[PDB]
Amino acid sequence: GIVEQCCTSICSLYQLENYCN
Amino acid sequence: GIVEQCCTSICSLYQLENYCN
Amino acid sequence: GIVEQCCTSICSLYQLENYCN
Amino acid sequence: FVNQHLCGSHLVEALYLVCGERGFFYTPKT
Amino acid sequence: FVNQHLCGSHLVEALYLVCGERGFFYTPKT
Amino acid sequence: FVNQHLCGSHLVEALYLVCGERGFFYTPKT
Ligand SMILES: [Zn+2]
Numbered sequence: 390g391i392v393e394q395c396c397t398s399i400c401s402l403y404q405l406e407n408y409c410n
Numbered sequence: 411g412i413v414e415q416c417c418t419s420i421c422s423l424y425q426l427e428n429y430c431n
Numbered sequence: 432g433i434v435e436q437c438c439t440s441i442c443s444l445y446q447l448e449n450y451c452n
Numbered sequence: 453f454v455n456q457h458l459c460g461s462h463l464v465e466a467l468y469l470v471c472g473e474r475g476f477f478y479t480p481k482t
Numbered sequence: 483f484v485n486q487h488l489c490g491s492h493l494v495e496a497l498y499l500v501c502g503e504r505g506f507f508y509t510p511k512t
Numbered sequence: 513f514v515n516q517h518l519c520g521s522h523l524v525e526a527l528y529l530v531c532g533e534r535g536f537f538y539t540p541k542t
Pocket residue numbers: 462492522
């Protein structure tokens with residue numbers, strides 16, 4: 390998931406925004 | 411010691427509490 | 432540069448001070 | 453914005469900044 | 483609580499939170 | 513003072529502390 394992707398690879402702020410309430 | 415154990419392995423909050431004054 | 436040196440090797444606070452304005 | 457490499461607590465700091473008053477869910481794989 | 487993997491400054495942040503007003507000693511091996 | 517091993521955001525935290533009100537430039541290689 391996002392936690393793993395950001396750490397093993399890279400992620401964007403736009404991808405992170407999907408986890409906001 | 412604790413500094414090394416927490417970083418090379420894992421440690422618990424209960425182990426950390428032993429370093430409080 | 433400094434960003435790379437501090438992370439791949441080590442750096443001193445005196446080296447860092449050169450990046451202050 | 454630029455892409456990010458974020459592990460551990462750094463990811464949570466990023467979520468806090470992106471989401472602000474909206475809040476967020478932190479859901480690691482187990 | 484859960485087990486932790488804590489390196490560098492992250493360990494000191496954890497000690498600060500666990501110990502609060504008690505304070506703590508940070509004693510790395512040299 | 514002691515030598516430092518500083519990566520990612522930890523380097524910027526260090527620059528902030530060393531430079532204070534002087535400010536600083538953060539200039540990674542690309
Ligand atoms: Zn870190």
